Amino acid sequence: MREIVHIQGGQCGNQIGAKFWEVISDEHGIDPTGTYHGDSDLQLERINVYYNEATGGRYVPRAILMDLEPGTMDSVRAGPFGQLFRPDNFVFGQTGAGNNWAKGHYTEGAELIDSVLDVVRKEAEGCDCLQGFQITHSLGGGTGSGMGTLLISKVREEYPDRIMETFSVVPSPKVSDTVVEPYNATLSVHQLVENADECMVIDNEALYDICFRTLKLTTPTYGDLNHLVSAAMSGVTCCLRFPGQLNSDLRKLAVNLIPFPRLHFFMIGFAPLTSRGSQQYRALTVPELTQQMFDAKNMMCAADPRHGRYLTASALFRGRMSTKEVDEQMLNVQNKNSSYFVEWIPNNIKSSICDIPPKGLKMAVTFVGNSTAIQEMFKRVAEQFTAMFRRKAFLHWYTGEGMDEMEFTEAESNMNDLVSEYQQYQDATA
Amino acid sequence: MREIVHIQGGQCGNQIGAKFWEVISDEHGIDPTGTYHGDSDLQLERINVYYNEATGGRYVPRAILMDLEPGTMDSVRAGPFGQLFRPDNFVFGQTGAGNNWAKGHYTEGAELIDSVLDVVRKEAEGCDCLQGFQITHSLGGGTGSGMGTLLISKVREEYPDRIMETFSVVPSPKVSDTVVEPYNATLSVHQLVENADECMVIDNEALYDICFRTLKLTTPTYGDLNHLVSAAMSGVTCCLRFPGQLNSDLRKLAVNLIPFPRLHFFMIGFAPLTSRGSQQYRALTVPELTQQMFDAKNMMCAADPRHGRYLTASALFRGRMSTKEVDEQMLNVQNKNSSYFVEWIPNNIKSSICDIPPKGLKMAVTFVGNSTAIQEMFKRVAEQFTAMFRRKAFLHWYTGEGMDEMEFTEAESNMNDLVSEYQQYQDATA
Amino acid sequence: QSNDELLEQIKNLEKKDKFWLSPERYQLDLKLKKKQILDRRQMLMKNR
Amino acid sequence: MPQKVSITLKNIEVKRKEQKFKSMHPWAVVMFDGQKKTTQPVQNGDLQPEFNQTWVFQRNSDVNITVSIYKKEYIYDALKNEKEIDLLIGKGKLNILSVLKKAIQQPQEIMVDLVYDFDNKLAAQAYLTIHIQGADLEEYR
Amino acid sequence: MREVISIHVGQGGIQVGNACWELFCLEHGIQPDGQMPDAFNTFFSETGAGKHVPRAVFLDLEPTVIDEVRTGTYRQLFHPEQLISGKEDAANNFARGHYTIGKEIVDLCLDRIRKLADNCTGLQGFLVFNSVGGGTGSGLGSLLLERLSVDYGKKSKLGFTIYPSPQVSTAVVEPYNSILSTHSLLEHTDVAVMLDNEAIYDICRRNLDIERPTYTNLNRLIAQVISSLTASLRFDGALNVDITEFQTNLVPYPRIHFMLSSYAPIISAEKAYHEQLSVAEITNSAFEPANMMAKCDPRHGKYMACSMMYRGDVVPKDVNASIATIKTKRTIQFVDWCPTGFKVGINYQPPTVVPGGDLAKVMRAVCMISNSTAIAEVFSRLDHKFDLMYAKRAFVHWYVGEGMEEGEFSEAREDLAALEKDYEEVGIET
Amino acid sequence: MREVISIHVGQGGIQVGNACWELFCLEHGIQPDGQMPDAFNTFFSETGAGKHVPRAVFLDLEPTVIDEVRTGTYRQLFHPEQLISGKEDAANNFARGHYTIGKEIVDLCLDRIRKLADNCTGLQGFLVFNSVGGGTGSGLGSLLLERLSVDYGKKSKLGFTIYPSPQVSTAVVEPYNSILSTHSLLEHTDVAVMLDNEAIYDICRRNLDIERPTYTNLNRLIAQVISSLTASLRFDGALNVDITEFQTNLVPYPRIHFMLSSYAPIISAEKAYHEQLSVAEITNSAFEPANMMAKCDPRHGKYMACSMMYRGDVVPKDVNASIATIKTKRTIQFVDWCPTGFKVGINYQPPTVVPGGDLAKVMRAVCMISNSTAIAEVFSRLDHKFDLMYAKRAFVHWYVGEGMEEGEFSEAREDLAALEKDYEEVGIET
Ligand SMILES: Nc1nc2c(ncn2[C@@H]2O[C@H](COP(=O)(O)OP(=O)(O)OP(=O)(O)O)[C@@H](O)[C@H]2O)c(=O)[nH]1
Ligand SMILES: Nc1nc2c(ncn2[C@@H]2O[C@H](COP(=O)(O)OP(=O)(O)OP(=O)(O)O)[C@@H](O)[C@H]2O)c(=O)[nH]1
Ligand SMILES: Nc1nc2c(ncn2[C@@H]2O[C@H](COP(=O)(O)OP(=O)(O)O)[C@@H](O)[C@H]2O)c(=O)[nH]1
Ligand SMILES: Nc1nc2c(ncn2[C@@H]2O[C@H](COP(=O)(O)OP(=O)(O)O)[C@@H](O)[C@H]2O)c(=O)[nH]1
Ligand SMILES: [Mg+2]
Ligand SMILES: [Mg+2]
Predict the structure, then answer these.
(1) Where in the sequence is the signal peptide annotated (chain C) (predicted)?
(2) Residues with CB under 6 A from ligand 1
(3) DSSP strand E in A54-202: where?
(4) Are residues B25 and B69 in the same domain?
């Protein structure tokens, strides 16, 4: 019951899913052949959340994979746990977008999306009670940031009451791999605010910083960043698949973390994270988890959370632990940092406990906090956008496929209005 | 009891029968030598429907094979299960028609048909209780579309109360193999509406589309199209040869699917159909069968069924399953698609259940729906006919054998009247 | 068509049909629900 | 544009004396460029049936007018049912190119010999009036 | 029970008959002695024990070629008294072979034709071969066709005439007898195929890469075309075509039956296997204007109907997928009153290779017989050549003194003018 | 399902095509005979059984080079009739190869291009190679580009032109045809890469330590650059880049698409292994002005956008840590309206070594494609060279007498003046 379907688009989203599904399968004891080989009874009670049942007793994820080029899905199939995905759900084009947002949203993405919407509708109509959808995509690419966001609007138009999740990677100015990143980032943020019920920003720069400083491993690769993102993704829905002292589905988090409908851009972090050589030194206790949870360097975004004030915060503890300690520590982390918490909403931290810890760990915490410090990312994105747009650089590529500069002006104005009205509440006082 | 005889004409009809009889024999466990080697008792209880009994314990089909040239029947005899056919039933001429309708209906087909009518009369007078006749022929050929349709009128004149089936392949404009297809298609449709109790149109284009998209096999051949047509043919009379929860002979379908005597042109489809590589992924359930059954691409005709409204529909489920699920799913497929069902006749879907599934499959469904979307085929056929006739192209071949242009004008007018009065009920409201 | 016109058509069909669920009534109820969702969305957009 | 040819069948003169047809119901077929036109049967037709029928034909490519004359004859079948049959009296073919120059300026009266298909002997003569109703070849180029 | 009789008259006719009769004997496994060391029945007859006798007759007034035939390796094959030979040649004079010396020979040929026809039971039709630009060939072909049209009536006759090239010519008087023979066979032959030598020379030069071809290389290609045309009568195929099924599909009107042929692929073993020879590329090559077997440009006129034969392992769906591509192209346009113009035939037997020949062994081939409006150019240029010399009455005394009347030249000119007007009248849109 | 077609015209084009086609065959394991003793599909095509055929066509009017190709070890590889050859050379005259002899050859080349394109299903784009300072090369390249731009339209074409050196020159008239060809490809080619010989001579002398290089050593480096550019289409990588993803990242405006390349490391086996070849040092060497592949100084102008490809075991974090260092340096400054200008690609396959060549085997390499404002100097110096001789109308009679008009020289001068003004207008800060 109350299950969700997985939809991913683009190369970055496909690579994120290729590790997210591996993590989920390892958590539920599903072999790469789709056969259950788990140890505990609880591993099968709520498997309908992510997995479907077919004849022969094997399980198949309800994931939908879409891209405008076939290479990435032809590569993910040969990887581990690549056989679980149903071949029918693979939809792809023969041309690609070339990191051009217009091509992936107006000319090419519009004709292809009917086929993927057909299978999306097939998956949603069938399921017992829908909880919602979760979306993984990147804002630094053309086909992803175009087709995914248009699909968001199409899904929202047909299921207005369901919940919608988006895990979005925004292009940081530090590690830049594409010159046209500001254009399709700014165009995508315009559409994303209007339809997504929840959005979670993730930055490659913050992932590299975490890998270099906390884990202290010499050579980070995309596999480590994907693993961290996958652990963070799994931590959110853990209590929906396992029993606990205070169950809290996604809708309950939506109620408690979004004060106003347009303020739904969160930054997350996962604890504990320790190096291989120091994993024996540390002792896992609730104070040790909560001190690392609120650490500024532990956030999955380069945004500095002590440059603003938290509107609200959430924590999803895992493992068996006493609730009194959790509540007193949450109170203590809020009394010692009163300057960084907005004062006109008292008791702005939500907590939840799940009795099933991750495989290999005795305690774990997932942190989701809505803070005013996120304005800095939109500020720098808009700064680069307005630095590049004033000369109409690279504009002809977009304008040759039916798009105009008016949609750029409206997007810039709406993004600046969002930036302004997000900080409006930072200076608000009672 | 209530058995039927098989009559086929032309090359296309002979090739269809060459696989239909193989499928029937494999279903009843009859070896190509006519010896029963089946496993279940039910395989022999109602074998009198299609097979006769001779001395020595072997079985012989009551099929009649006719053509104006001997090549096709001289070739079908050397194929598998070719020895079952009685040599006496083979009737053929020495000249052929050359795809000319006039030659196969006025000059050559008139003299030969006495011999085949003799054996037809021998077969029908003898049988216990006649149910009716089923006819397989093609509308794209001369000898077939002429001699078969004249034989239809001759049979109807002598057995006015029996039921008559015709499985007719109409020439599509996409895959055209003969230039004179519109003439003998239009001439044949004129006679076919006046005498056939039921007609089922089949298109090669739709068969290629199905083979390429659903089965996803690389190289379709006529053997695959024949196999699909044969499975669809067998599915209709399954409950007449096997026990079931709600038996429904051909006459019961005739009562429930034909509202007015001139509206008896159906399009059919068979489910399930899955690729070899995905036959393990799918799980056979009633929802899975019914979602594929009403799929537009699954129809055996290129006509698009969401371009019109169903007057009525029928489904013949196979296998052992609960009736409550079937009824609720039929209700659900009719509540969610109220726009495509005519409103002045409520509850316009007929269902039937047979407890004996096809060999190798646990569940199967045959769909027969009378829809207003079939008008498009007659529209394009008449369009090509009037494009070619206005210049009197190829007319001398037909007019040199006693035919005139008046019979062409009457045929065109009657066909257009049929097209108009078939859509008259589409716009009708209560 | 106004929301009141659609409700009056539904009430007039309720007076004409002895059956609580005619196919025509079901289509009008679906039209009414779709419109109330659009009006609610327009009010939520005006309140932003 | 397709040229219009007006063909009037005036009368036919039957020359074959050995068939004293007791009551002839003669009727004629005029064919030109795949188009067929037929007269009504003349009641009590003598050896000289008059038709006086005019038809307009569209000319696409053919140059040949075919005239055929038939009579109705009633034959008893093997069951003594009266069966009406059309018996050909004669058939003739006229090439319109022979008369084209004059038939454009004014209606042309033309005799067409009708032969019987079995013996190729002169069976009858048809009297036709032919009237033919291009300037735009540079405009089309 | 299906038969066909081939008539060879003149030097060119006999030299192409030799070419086709090596190929047939090789294709049916019959040794040159006539002895095998049920498909043969179309071209041959069984003598009761041992050898097979061709259903062919060779005619010529000049004895050299027949004497060469009666001493070669094939001396034992042909019946000794069906190689009718004269004493005095017509010497390129048409009036000689139609009025003076051909009349005394034609009776023996007709007696031989009767003696061969009484043996056949399912006679499909006649084939005739004759080079048009010669006295005996054209004259005797005309006389034989005129006698056969009344002796047999409705039996179909096919003529593989070789018209002179536009500028290349061997004689100086061949336009006269070419025009007269066209007059004669216009109202007497059901099908006429164009075969001028210049186009085939260009084909050999471009594809076969032979810089010094002789007549044998041309005749082998013609023999291959004949074999491809008649394969459907003696081999099993998924989509058969008979000879009588032509005037109903390629001949819109009784006057218009001159069409031009093409063949593909034509390639040598030195570079054949480096490319895959897919069905799409061969069917594209067959429609190339440079691969026409007659030196006419199809781009200068409309198409009326295309009948095109395949043989090998071709699948119908691949054929349809290639007919669609051709309909797509803008450089090939069909006439307005013909929506579909393709008749397709598929056969399983691959083309056979002759040892020491030019063509290599391939698994797929295509032969097209296409009727197009552009053929009027050859008639116009032959007419222009005729008028130049007929203005001064040159070479006429060689014809008036052989019994022909003075006015006989004019009416052939009038019939050609009528044909040219008819071709223009048909090609205009409505 | 991704393909690309490479066009080689002229002596320099054919001699660099040979260089790239040893490298591709070596990299995919294909022997020179074409036989292997799924990545090949980008450059090759499967023939069904055995050999592979390159998707390349060789063009030249002068037969010597093609004859050398058709007798070397690679005689069996290329299809015999895609090595189009002429009879008479253009002899460094541009008007000859654009108006006199190139027109009669261009039709065969276009037919070959169509025959190669119909085979591909996912055609990414075209590659073309031509030395600019020659008659046939520049003229035929211009004509082919002009025909392709209208036959296909939006398909991408890439040009690897070799402009003359600042002072070193082999001809005396090459500025004229260089300017005319720049005129022709300015409005017709999507990407143009600079390749003058003097810079590569200096690279060989300084790094490879060869004091007597020949053309083969230059062509091997060019082949390595091509392989590095196209590696991402046929090998798995953490950060892929497609050809269509260029005009969205390197081309700010439609007129500006001339950029200059560089490669690193370039080192011999005698001293390669003594140093570690870290990613930082190779990415520093790639940006050195002395390692530009075209003799232009980047210190004289701003950068617009840098697209730079890695291959081997490079980790993204090390790439980011090196992009930061380059942004730090004060000697490299980017344009004001471009905050981020780097597009990064990472591939796993290390560069392959050719036996007997100059370069050694290394695990890391970097190839950069950089668009900079400093490129205007080559245009200015070519313009100055052109004006000196055009003042006195020298050598003009060799062009006017080959069909070219007198005024055609002036408009190329005006377009170069427009381009130089545009480059100055873009580089000024706002
Ligand atoms: N394709 C082809 N054409 C031929 C061949 N031999 C002759 N011709 C053509 O035939 C024309 C002349 O007619 P021929 O067949 O040579 O001689 P004929 O038909 O026997 O007539 P006579 O001269 O009276 O003997 C020439 O213009 C040639 O083009 C041949 O072997 N192959
Ligand atoms: N990089 C490089 N450049 C070459 C090579 N061969 C010739 N060139 C350049 O090409 C220029 C002249 O054009 P070519 O390619 O030699 O001759 P072409 O393009 O065939 O033109 P034609 O003279 O008409 O035959 C010279 O200035 C050379 O700099 C080569 O092998 N490598
Ligand atoms: N975490 C992670 N990020 C990736 C991976 N591959 C690419 N990216 C990021 O995705 C961005 C490029 O997105 P792109 O591949 O063009 O998206 P697309 O246009 O939808 O295919 C780069 O800035 C990378 O930082 C990966 O395997 N893992
Ligand atoms: N399904 C199927 N259709 C066929 C087969 N053979 C021919 N056809 C169809 O039949 C049509 C030609 O009919 P034809 O053979 O001329 O019928 P006939 O005149 O009675 O012999 C073609 O358009 C084909 O699509 C076959 O083996 N299977
Ligand atoms: Mg001779
Ligand atoms: Mg040269």
Answers:
(1) none
(2) E 10-12, 15, 62, 89-92, 131, 133-137, 162, 164, 170-171, 174, 197, 215, 218-219
(3) 59-61, 63-67, 90-92, 130-138, 163-169, 198-202
(4) yes
